[PDB]
Amino acid sequence: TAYLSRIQRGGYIQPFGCMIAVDESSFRIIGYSENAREMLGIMILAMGTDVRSLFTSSSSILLERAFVAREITLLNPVWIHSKNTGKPFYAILHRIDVGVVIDLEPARTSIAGAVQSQKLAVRAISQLQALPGGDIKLLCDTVVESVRDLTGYDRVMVYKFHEDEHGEVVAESKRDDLEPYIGLHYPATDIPQASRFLFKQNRVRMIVDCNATPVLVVQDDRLTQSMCLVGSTLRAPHGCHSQYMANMGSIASLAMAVIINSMRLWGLVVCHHTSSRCIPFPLRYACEFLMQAFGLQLNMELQLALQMSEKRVLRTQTLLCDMLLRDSPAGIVTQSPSIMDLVKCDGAAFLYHGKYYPLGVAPSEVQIKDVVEWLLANHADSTGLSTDSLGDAGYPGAAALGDAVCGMAVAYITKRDFLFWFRSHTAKEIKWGGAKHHPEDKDDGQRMHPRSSFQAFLEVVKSRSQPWETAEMDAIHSLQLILRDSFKESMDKFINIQGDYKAIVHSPNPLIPPIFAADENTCCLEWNMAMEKLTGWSRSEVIGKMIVGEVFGSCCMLKGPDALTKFMIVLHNAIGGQDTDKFPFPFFDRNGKFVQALLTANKRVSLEGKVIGAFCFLQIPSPELQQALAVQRRQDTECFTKAKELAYICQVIKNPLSGMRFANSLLEATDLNEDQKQLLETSVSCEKQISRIVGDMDLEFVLKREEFFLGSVINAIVSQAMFLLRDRGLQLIRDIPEEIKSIEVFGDQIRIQQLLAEFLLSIIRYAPSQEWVEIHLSQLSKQMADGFAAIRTEFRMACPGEGLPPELVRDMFHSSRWTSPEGLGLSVCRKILKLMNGEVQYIRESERSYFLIILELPV
Amino acid sequence: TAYLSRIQRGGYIQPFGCMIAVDESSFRIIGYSENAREMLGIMILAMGTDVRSLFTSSSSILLERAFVAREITLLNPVWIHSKNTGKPFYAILHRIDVGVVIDLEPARSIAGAVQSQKLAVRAISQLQALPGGDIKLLCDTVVESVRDLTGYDRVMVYKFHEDEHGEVVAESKRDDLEPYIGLHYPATDIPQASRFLFKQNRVRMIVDCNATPVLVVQDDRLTQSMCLVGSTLRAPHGCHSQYMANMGSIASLAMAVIINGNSMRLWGLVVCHHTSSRCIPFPLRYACEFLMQAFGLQLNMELQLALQMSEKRVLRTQTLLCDMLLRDSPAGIVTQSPSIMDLVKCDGAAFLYHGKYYPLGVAPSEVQIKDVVEWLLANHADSTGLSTDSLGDAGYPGAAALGDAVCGMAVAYITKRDFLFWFRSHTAKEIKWGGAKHHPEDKDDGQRMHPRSSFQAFLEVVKSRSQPWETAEMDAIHSLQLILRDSFKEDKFINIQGDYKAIVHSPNPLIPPIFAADENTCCLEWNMAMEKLTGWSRSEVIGKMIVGEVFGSCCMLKGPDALTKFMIVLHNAIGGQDTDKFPFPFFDRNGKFVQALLTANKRVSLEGKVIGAFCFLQIPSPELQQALAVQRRQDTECFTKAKELAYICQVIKNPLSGMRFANSLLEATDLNEDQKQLLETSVSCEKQISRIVGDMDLESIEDGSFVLKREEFFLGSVINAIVSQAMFLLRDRGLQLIRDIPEEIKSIEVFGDQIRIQQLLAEFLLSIIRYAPSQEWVEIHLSQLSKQMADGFAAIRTEFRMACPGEGLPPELVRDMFHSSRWTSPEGLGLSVCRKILKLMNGEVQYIRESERSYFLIILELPV
Ligand SMILES: *[C@@H](C)[C@H]1/C(=C/c2[nH]c(/C=C3N=C(/C=C4\NC(=O)C(C=C)=C4C)C(C)=C\3CCC(=O)O)c(CCC(=O)O)c2C)NC(=O)[C@@H]1C
Ligand SMILES: *[C@H](C)[C@H]1/C(=C/c2[nH]c(/C=C3N=C(/C=C4\NC(=O)C(C=C)=C4C)C(C)=C\3CCC(=O)O)c(CCC(=O)O)c2C)NC(=O)[C@@H]1C
């Protein structure tokens, strides 16, 4: 490991402090520094000098008290008064390989221990803890503000390492006469892995002056090996880091590690001062405690993000069970939870003995035959390819395919049948600082000097998409596995290609849950390989047996006070036509091993023969998601103040919705007035919004994208606010580019007119009475490829007036915080755009109004 | 035990079915009944005979496959035909230690456990969508469920109490009979033998008490009788038969309510009484067994909720105990918001310290308290604390002079004649027994053969008598006296109950593990309970900072982030911010992991605003700390549920304005008036939705009554709205509709809330279509009839009738509809609210079964 020998064993310190290596046994010096002779005033000092008699008697007994401790971190910093000049000195004790070593820093102007120093921190920590969760950026901004108002540095920032080991400055609280560093990515080789393990062990590290001379320590002659000083607050930085800071335009740096707990180094809070800044060790230990609280909240939010990822994998497992209950593989594309909802993507294709099935932005049949022919010639062995960019993969015609179909994930099914997923190009620009990260860059300890340039240069990725993770390829391989199993009714290599690195072959585990299926008598119809492996019982021995009593009562032991009844109530509900999701299922292995599974029993409903049955899977989440699902299953029984009225609305409203859509379905017959026919179409698109809104509900998802005229949305949204402008007199102004016959834009008509309802109505809400209002939309049918087009649409819903209040836009732009009904609705309809390829800004001018950009795709 | 041999080995069956006890190896008849030859119609059944010659060859393989199976219970009941006459049977077969007894009940389908349980499933899901915290609603639901299933005349929940006597906690019966609800019964009515029978055969059916017990025959060489503990066909004990005759119970069906945890304890019985001889088929008895299993599940959930609510109150008394431990004066106990009366629930409290009587609530005068103190010095001097339920049974004269108020007493003795008193006023506990009154000395006599002739509801009042002091409340008192005893410096407890011996004990105290941190986080005060918990002694950890070394270095805290969490929360305790029940999992100096609940609050010296931080630990059972986790995450779940409701109301309101604008702009031209009727049906649905998400919060006495729109309407709108609201589910299920409605084109001036009428009408009619069978008709009958209240105030009476030809809507769902504030499904919930709207709107609804199930509802509105 490059620089590990140099940094740790390099005996050079900074001139602001004095380090004194003394063995605890008899206060005998085994090391010292050159500036100690000046800053102490000692002008007797040698190897063997009793330093207990070099200070006040109070600080003598304090130092020998701080020697004999379990942990010495609590003691730091002991207040030590010197004797040869009388000036008090902070004394940062820490134990090293053979002895301890003090670190004397002069004090300008009483902190006797860690707790007194932490008392400064606790106010900022209390401000940091009382923060809404689910937004790392707000937490980082709170940390940089707290560290700025504590330390008094010019520019503090949160450097965050990525998965590539390269970092990015994700927060800033700079002094405003400087330049912003937010967004600037730095290479991995900029900070060596030796320095990051150094920060894992040391966790706070200041310098005072980079242009200061490195004061060398005097190593003991008897021991050849140099001192392995890691936890010293005084040791000078490497000649490379010192020159680097001289080139950076910041001569004082306080960097402290953001550990996330086994001991992942998430990032670094790096402070920068333009002048030479010192800071007392009580304030430095306060900021180390502030970094402890930062790591605390950050781990509390990364665990929540990983639990949301596990919930998303559980949804993917339910989707694969949906795909298992389909009569043909052609049904997958035809039906509504299709192959483009399995994976976050933009198109999806299925080739099934010809008659190619495209969804969204997918190549035509000739183009996909070119893709298939490239997949047969190259990557012949590997069943799955997950290329970030087709151009990097080597497929000819990638330029002809365009940026729209740049990313492609394929899965091979038998008999030359292929499953495809397609992704459009992501317009991400990385403002690299000095040097772009090179994935071939290893740690080069023979490099003397760092680059002098730090002008950030934007690097734009030309024709590549979002990366394909292991989870999405896991889902793709699982669905490919079930489709090949269906093929047998009537080994797998996967190549991952990304722009930064090169083609790697990885075998992905399937994501199929353990599945059994029973008929009305609870006799086994199905018991798949996953369930066979989990329980240990083979399918053949348990097929035909009674699931409710035999197989799970004796054969595969259940667990609980009375669990079998809980099982027998559940499966009889499945046969009876009631489905339970994520019912807890603690059962034992054949070999006596506990499994804390989550049973889901769905009715095996079919056509008018074999009407009802049971299909069940056994999702096994981590025990923190067992807890996270128990804390919401122990909470629907308590919110009976409003869950009764929610189920009351969600059941009673269904009947006049069916009457509305049956009157409107029978009213489509013979209405030859095309103005009235379009008006009825507006009513059908209005009734549908209520049925989609009530039926889908809100739980923040799935988008039922279909072909629709875009002018059929404005006409379906001018009629919602038209009562609110007919009574408040807002004579509206429209100027459209006639997006009637702007056909086939791919998306939700319903969720788009719901977000435009909650934005337009909020705009017309806060207008002056008997006025006007402007709506306007500028479309540009930008061609993206040979045959692929996209229509980018702004929405200028412009109103002159007082406008929405300043707090309600932060209500809208929250993550989980709300105080108003209208604000809640605004927040949800903003998150609807955050789920669907667009965003929304609120601008404040002489007219207070909403910009709204949605990118939709004419097939 | 008493009667166990007589019941288990009493070779007597009931005559409603025959019984053959075959072998387990080669199908020989080890035993049989006298009425086997008459039931099978044989008029060969003898010693050691092959049993499969009696039944049909096709039925024979069912018996053999039942024998091969490891669990005989699942196959039961195997439908078995007869070879000599062609008669069906239910051959319920169970395994005994010396063979396999097969019980033949003549059938008049179901061949297994699953088919039987399918009947129970609807009632089981009825009592599982029920709100927790109560037991009366649960036991009042299960009796209607069993009355719907069994059909017995009177079904009641006979809950056992702690001294083995039982009372009818909930009873459902037809309105002809005597109400048994509240009636306590002596513990000798149900012997320990019967309880141990119910713990291994949980459904017992007596077809006829009067009917003679048919004798068994046995070919077994060994001298023992057949085993009939598990057999459904076992004759009741003669005493129990006489008992049933003397109660008016001709037939009975007693079902065990076994609750168990991880220890099966029989909670109570669901005895079903019939005023005539009745037998229900074994599908229904096995269904009722499964329903009793679900009932035991719901009772287990209610008992665990009660246990953790008691333990939450235990932690609340510990919090109040430390609140009364940090006081400068001993007299602060009497006068503060968390008073001594708050510690242990009581009518009054009294603290005697160096005389100077400190009364609270209802308390006896100083002379009276001095006299009772003199009595407590004269008797029970040796024991410190006394908690007499009644002072009259304690032995104290002048209890009548004290009156009802000072009857119940709880005493804590502190040194140098210092006392703590809690007083409870006389609670009028009047428990009407049935027949005899239970005494705790009454044992189950093994040779008694005749029950009591009487079962009349005679009262039994109590004396000057209070609510019983519990173990936990006396424990709270015990901890309070110990902490006050230590506070002054800075064991036998007698409990007297009016029905029991004066029990002498000493309970485990509730002083929580306490450490007190100063401003520099150094443990000033260290409790003996911390020394019991972590093992660290006080005089070794003294003078050491807690956050870093006493906790982190000495005790192994959680590795990822417990040390940072503890340091932040203790420095916030020193910063004035008190925190309650922080999750604090840690290890000890022995090494055993111990999760806890750190509560850290600021300590005040009364001259310094926040000098020091006080702390105390509570250690719960893991269900309680998980319930505190769900108490914390209620702030995320319940507000997101309310957020879902408010979001739904607003975002639904927007296209309702779009809907009414589209349907008030569609009024240009509708050429055929059928198109205008479809349009007006859509307008009615839109107004219906705008009223469903209007200003109502689902109470019907504050919102549905205060907001009730009153406008004129025309009834063809309502009828075509109902048909349009129903046609999608009609065409989904392939049904017919036969709307036998007269002409109401001319009744334009009927004046009532039409939108609520079409809401309730569609809810009723779509429940009918939801439970109408596949591919048949549904009838909509109306009969508009005149009704007169005045010459100009004339009303109307329309009777909506909805009929379907089949099994129809299940009885559980109508029970949910008429229960009022109880619902199982959201469909039954909407039916319940649409029933309450008809109750509010001068009408009434019925569900009538006349071999084709029909829905009947009337309503009254006045034309103008
Ligand atoms: C006479 C010897 C004593 C006696 C004996 C006895 N009792 C049983 C079984 C039961 N007794 C029950 C009592 C009740 N029945 C009710 O309806 C109510 C209240 C509403 C009560 C309190 C019940 C119940 C049973 C369970 C059996 C059943 O079918 O219900 C037995 C065992 C009989 C058997 O073979 O199963 C015996 C020996 N009971 C008496 O009261 C006198 C003191
Ligand atoms: C030498 C050829 C290479 C080198 C060596 C090097 N760097 C460190 C430690 C740090 N480097 C940091 C880089 C940044 N400083 C910033 O302000 C930003 C972004 C805004 C970045 C990316 C940081 C931070 C550290 C930690 C602070 C610290 O003092 O450690 C070290 C370890 C030195 C030590 O102190 O022991 C070394 C050997 N860096 C280079 O860029 C060249 C290629």
From Swiss-Prot, chain A:
<comment type="subunit">
    <text>Homodimer. Interacts with ADO1 and PKS4. Stabilized by interactions with PAPP5 and FYPP3 which are enhanced in the phosphorylated Pfr form. Interacts with VOZ1 and VOZ2. Binds, via its photosensory domain, to PTAC12/HMR/PAP5 when photoactivated; this interaction stimulates its localization to photobodies. Interacts with CRY1 specifically when in the dark/far-red (Pr) state, but not when red light-activated (Pfr). Interacts with PIF4 and PIF5 in response to low blue light (LBL). Component of a red light-dependent nuclear complex made of PHL, PHYB and CO. Interacts directly with PHL.</text>
</comment>
<comment type="similarity">
    <text>Belongs to the phytochrome family.</text>
</comment>
<feature type="domain" description="PAS 2">
    <location>
        <begin position="500"/>
        <end position="571"/>
    </location>
</feature>
<dbReference type="GO" id="GO:0010617">
    <property type="term" value="P:circadian regulation of calcium ion oscillation"/>
</dbReference>
<dbReference type="GO" id="GO:0009867">
    <property type="term" value="P:jasmonic acid mediated signaling pathway"/>
</dbReference>
<dbReference type="GO" id="GO:0009409">
    <property type="term" value="P:response to cold"/>
</dbReference>
<protein>
    <recommendedName>
        <fullName>Phytochrome B</fullName>
    </recommendedName>
</protein>
<dbReference type="Pfam" id="PF00360">
    <property type="entry name" value="PHY"/>
</dbReference>
<keyword id="KW-0963">Cytoplasm</keyword>
<dbReference type="GO" id="GO:0031516">
    <property type="term" value="F:far-red light photoreceptor activity"/>
</dbReference>
<keyword id="KW-0677">Repeat</keyword>
<dbReference type="GO" id="GO:0016604">
    <property type="term" value="C:nuclear body"/>
</dbReference>
<dbReference type="GO" id="GO:0010374">
    <property type="term" value="P:stomatal complex development"/>
</dbReference>
<keyword id="KW-0607">Phytochrome signaling pathway</keyword>
<feature type="domain" description="Histidine kinase">
    <location>
        <begin position="648"/>
        <end position="859"/>
    </location>
</feature>
<dbReference type="GO" id="GO:0016607">
    <property type="term" value="C:nuclear speck"/>
</dbReference>
<dbReference type="GO" id="GO:0010202">
    <property type="term" value="P:response to low fluence red light stimulus"/>
</dbReference>
<dbReference type="Pfam" id="PF01590">
    <property type="entry name" value="GAF"/>
</dbReference>
<dbReference type="GO" id="GO:0042802">
    <property type="term" value="F:identical protein binding"/>
</dbReference>
<dbReference type="InterPro" id="IPR043150">
    <property type="entry name" value="Phytochrome_PHY_sf"/>
</dbReference>
<dbReference type="GO" id="GO:1990841">
    <property type="term" value="F:promoter-specific chromatin binding"/>
</dbReference>
<dbReference type="GO" id="GO:0010218">
    <property type="term" value="P:response to far red light"/>
</dbReference>
<dbReference type="InterPro" id="IPR044767">
    <property type="entry name" value="Phy_HATPase-like"/>
</dbReference>
<dbReference type="GO" id="GO:0009416">
    <property type="term" value="P:response to light stimulus"/>
</dbReference>
<dbReference type="GO" id="GO:0015979">
    <property type="term" value="P:photosynthesis"/>
</dbReference>
<dbReference type="InterPro" id="IPR013654">
    <property type="entry name" value="PAS_2"/>
</dbReference>
<dbReference type="InterPro" id="IPR012129">
    <property type="entry name" value="Phytochrome_A-E"/>
</dbReference>
<dbReference type="Pfam" id="PF00512">
    <property type="entry name" value="HisKA"/>
</dbReference>
<dbReference type="InterPro" id="IPR035965">
    <property type="entry name" value="PAS-like_dom_sf"/>
</dbReference>
<dbReference type="InterPro" id="IPR005467">
    <property type="entry name" value="His_kinase_dom"/>
</dbReference>
<dbReference type="GO" id="GO:0043565">
    <property type="term" value="F:sequence-specific DNA binding"/>
</dbReference>
<dbReference type="InterPro" id="IPR036890">
    <property type="entry name" value="HATPase_C_sf"/>
</dbReference>
<dbReference type="InterPro" id="IPR016132">
    <property type="entry name" value="Phyto_chromo_attachment"/>
</dbReference>
<dbReference type="GO" id="GO:0009640">
    <property type="term" value="P:photomorphogenesis"/>
</dbReference>
<keyword id="KW-0238">DNA-binding</keyword>
<keyword id="KW-0600">Photoreceptor protein</keyword>
<dbReference type="GO" id="GO:0031347">
    <property type="term" value="P:regulation of defense response"/>
</dbReference>
<keyword id="KW-0157">Chromophore</keyword>
<keyword id="KW-0539">Nucleus</keyword>
<comment type="function">
    <text>Regulatory photoreceptor which exists in two forms that are reversibly interconvertible by light: the Pr form that absorbs maximally in the red region of the spectrum and the Pfr form that absorbs maximally in the far-red region. Photoconversion of Pr to Pfr induces an array of morphogenetic responses, whereas reconversion of Pfr to Pr cancels the induction of those responses. Pfr controls the expression of a number of nuclear genes including those encoding the small subunit of ribulose-bisphosphate carboxylase, chlorophyll A/B binding protein, protochlorophyllide reductase, rRNA, etc.</text>
</comment>
<dbReference type="GO" id="GO:2000028">
    <property type="term" value="P:regulation of photoperiodism, flowering"/>
</dbReference>
<dbReference type="GO" id="GO:0009687">
    <property type="term" value="P:abscisic acid metabolic process"/>
</dbReference>
